[PDB]
Every structure is written in structure tokens, then in C-alpha cells.
Predict the structure of Cytochrome P450 3A5.
Amino acid sequence: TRTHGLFKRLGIPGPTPLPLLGNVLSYRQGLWKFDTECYKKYGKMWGTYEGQLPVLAITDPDVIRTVLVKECYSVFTNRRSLGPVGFMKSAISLAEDEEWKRIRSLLSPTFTSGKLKEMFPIIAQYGDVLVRNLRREAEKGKPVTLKDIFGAYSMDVITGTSFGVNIDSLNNPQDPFVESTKKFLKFGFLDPLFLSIILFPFLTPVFEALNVSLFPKDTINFLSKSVNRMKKSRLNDKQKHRLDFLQLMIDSQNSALSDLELAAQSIIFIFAGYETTSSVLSFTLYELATHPDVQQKLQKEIDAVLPNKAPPTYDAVVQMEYLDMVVNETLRLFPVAIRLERTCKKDVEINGVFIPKGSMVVIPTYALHHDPKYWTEPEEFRPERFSKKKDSIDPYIYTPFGTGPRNCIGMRFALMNMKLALIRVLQNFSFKPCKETQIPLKLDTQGLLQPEKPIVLKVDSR
Ligand SMILES: CC(C)c1nc(CN(C)C(=O)N[C@H](C(=O)N[C@@H](Cc2ccccc2)C[C@H](O)[C@H](Cc2ccccc2)NC(=O)OCc2cncs2)C(C)C)cs1
Ligand code: HEM
């Protein structure tokens, strides 16, 4: 109740906060739904409270440009001050201020145009295994749980291109990396440990001293230990040397990246490479199965650019007009990060009102992606909205990978291996909804964008 008068003090609209909880009780419907309702109810700018933390939501593209680009280094340098996390504070998505600039600069050469071109044969090989394993479920005639097999593909791709190691997750029913990584998705806003940090932020140093973390400790330890084995095997074996993500961090120690810092960056990449890639792929295939005209029209383009099921090329992947439209439209309906989050490093006036230091500024990506002002009938899947040329698309309304220095470091990587998977499977298969298919697709109410029930489809040849 201490800060619960800040937004009325500035003449900013917003829902009335509950004394101890603020507006967190309104997250029960889903953080995406709360931002949508607030966007329609209030204007271009509304204020909420996560416990004591004041949260300013902005939708003016001119204002969004200021916080994400112009004043990114000036003020909005840090994303969000998370609770008790332990050594994971050095992870790039959690780092702050100059430490983040150092980590980001060191990791930036990971995804250049040349490095994307070199890892293409690695990704293409996993795609062959993907088509081979998906054929077995098709010839049997059983429904396919998309998040399983496409999750194994994503886990294989990220580990193979970042650490040069083939863990064979596509052919491992009990793959340890997937079992570990999917534990990051279980935590939600109404979890007792996390909810206590929201309501009582002063508990974060307490749990830190007690060595309690918001992250699953079994998962953190397995990945840290498993990554440390791949690093030691990289130094003893000079023949297995590739200029990749893991190597780039090993070269940092010649100057300087800690073993914990190296483990922190690896955990982010493994989680991002597995979860986001497989989630969006499962939405794309859901939208294709529920829109057969779009799927067959997408297959028509593939068979033309790659005649006779020809293996794709790097350039042929980035040439495809309709494929880029299908992926961009999936990311419009299902932006996996509901919002873009920035924290005021100092006191700043944003849109005229003065915002105190420590407050959070939020760009409601999901709400702006579903705005009827920018998208006619926003709940419908129409790849025709987009073209491969994005000259007309506002960079601050359509933000599936964020914008500015803090944008997604792996956007080009994520778009490549998703398109490669789609090309490979669509030139060999067609996806149909079945009895277990949930239509319409209901979104989950906790954390990242996830289906309420796992997406299952039937897969046939051709
Ligand atoms: C930490 C994890 C176990 C928890 N998940 C939850 C579920 N919830 C409500 C959230 O995650 N809610 C919020 C959130 O999504 N924050 C995030 C917003 C975001 C989204 C996309 C890209 C970049 C940043 C920002 C956070 O720093 C998380 C922390 C993290 C790290 C490793 C593994 C899992 C999670 N970062 C990521 O998920 O980065 C991975 C990604 C990179 N590119 C796309 S996803 C925060 C309150 C954490 C509670 S605790
Ligand atoms: C469909 C796939 C993906 C989507 C939609 C996505 C989306 C996003 C978004 C919205 C952000 C925040 C942008 C901002 O705050 O301005 C982000 C940040 C980030 N992404 Fe992704 N992501 C994807 C895949 C990946 C992959 C595969 C990797 C790495 C292999 C990755 C690495 C990162 C990192 C490290 C950050 C934080 C960068 C920083 O804080 O400086 N992402 N991503």
C-alpha cells in the first residue's frame, strides 16, 4: 500500500490495486489476457502493481522507441530484477549494466551470417532424422504429440550447433536434457516461492543467503555439470574444434568468463533453443492443420523451390515468401514472451510523467499483436497480412523478438532451424487435426505461451 498511489499521483489510468497483492490477482486469466483487457479498457498507457512494484505499460510506438532504442543505455538498460537466482545472475538475459554489455559483446559473434551458413549442414542432418522418426509414427497411423518429437529436434539442434555434441535426443525416449529443461516451464505466478518474492521483495536476499533459487536446482546442476564435461572434452580434444558458441566462451578465459558465468550462458541457450523453437513450431503446425488451404498453398511453394523433395539450401530457406509469412503470422498470434520488460535505472520522465527509479516499463507484445487497430480480425490466422518485406510493419508494434540492443540475440538462428524443420516435414508430410486435437486452442494461464493441452495431430505422407 506504500506505492499504491503512484499512478493516481501522475494522472495515469489503471486498475485499482489490492492492498498486499497489487494487481497480481488479475493474472489468473493469463498475463496475455490481463494486458488485452487493460489495453481495451484504458488508453495508450496504463499502470499496474505487482505487489509494491509499479509497472507502466506503454503502447505508443514513439514512446516504445524511446525505451527500447534511444534511452536503452541511458535508462532502460536492465530487463527485470529477478528474485533469488544464485549464480544465474550472470546469465545474459539476467545480467545488468556493464556486466551485460560485456556478456552481450562477447556472445554477439555467435550468430553472424557466416556462422549461420556453416551450421546449416548440422541442422539439415537433424532434419533428416526428424523426417525419419516422424515417418514411423505416420506409417503406424498414431497421433503425434508435436512438442515431443519437435522438442527433441530443437534440443538436438541447439546442443549440436552450440557445443558440437550429438546427444541424440531424437532417438532417446528418456533424453536427460529435455527432462531437465522442461522443468523451467512448471513455475507460475501463483507459486508460493515466487509469489512471496513478488509480495515481499525483501525476501530475495534472505533466500539468497539460504541458497534457495527460483530455478529447479536439479536442472541447474545437471546442465552446469553436463556443460562442464563438454568444455573439458573440448580442451583435451583439439581435433573436435569448431568456432561456435561454446568455443567463443572458452576463448574468453585467455584474457574473462568464469566457469559459473559460462554455465549461466549455456543454460539460457539450451532453454531458448529447446523451448521457444519447439513451441512456435507446434503452433505453426497447429495453424497449418486447422487451415488446410494455407498448408497446401505452403506446400505448393516448397515443391516449386525444391523440386522432387530436393534437400533445402541456406539461400532457399531465406528466399521463401509464403514460408516467412506463415512463421511471422504464428509469432503474431503466439508471441512467446507476453511482454517486453525494462527497468528504470534512474528517475526518468517517459511520456511526460516522471517515473521513479526501480519501476518497470512493459511493452505488451501480445496485446499489440492482437490489436484490431493494427490487424483486421486479429484472432484469425492469415499469413497474407505479412510479406517477406517488412517495410510496412512497424518495428515497435510487431515485436516478437524485441527491438534495440536488448533484442533477441538468437532471432536469425531461431528463424533458420524452424524454417528448415517446416520445409523438411512439409515436403514429406501433411498435418490434419484429429479427435484429440483441441479446437479452438486454449492458452495456458501461467508463464510463457503454452497450449492448455499438448498439441497432438495426425501425420500422413505427401
Ligand atoms: C525462472 C523460471 C523457473 C520461472 N518461470 C516462471 C514463469 N513466469 C511467470 C515467468 O517466467 N515470468 C517472467 C518471464 O517470463 N521472464 C522472462 C521474459 C523473457 C521472455 C522471452 C525472452 C526473454 C525474456 C525473462 C527471464 O529472465 C527468463 C528467465 C529464465 C532463464 C532460463 C530458463 C527459464 C527462464 N528468461 C528466459 O526465459 O530467457 C529465455 C528466452 C530467450 N529468448 C526467448 S525465451 C519472469 C517473472 C521470470 C516463474 S519462475
Ligand atoms: C521463436 C524463437 C524465439 C523467440 C520468439 C524469442 C523471443 C525473444 C524476446 C521477445 C526476447 C526479449 C527481447 C527484448 O527484451 O527486447 C528475447 C531475448 C533473448 N533471446 Fe530469444 N527468442 C527465440 C529464440 C531464441 C534462441 C533460439 C536463442 C539462443 C540460442 C535466444 C536467445 C535470447 C537471449 C540470450 C535473449 C536475451 C538477450 C539480452 O537480454 O541481451 N532466443 N528473445
The chain has 17 helices and nine strands. The first strand starts at residue 45 and ends at 50. Residues 1-462 form a domain with the Cytochrome p450 fold (CATH 1.10.630.10).
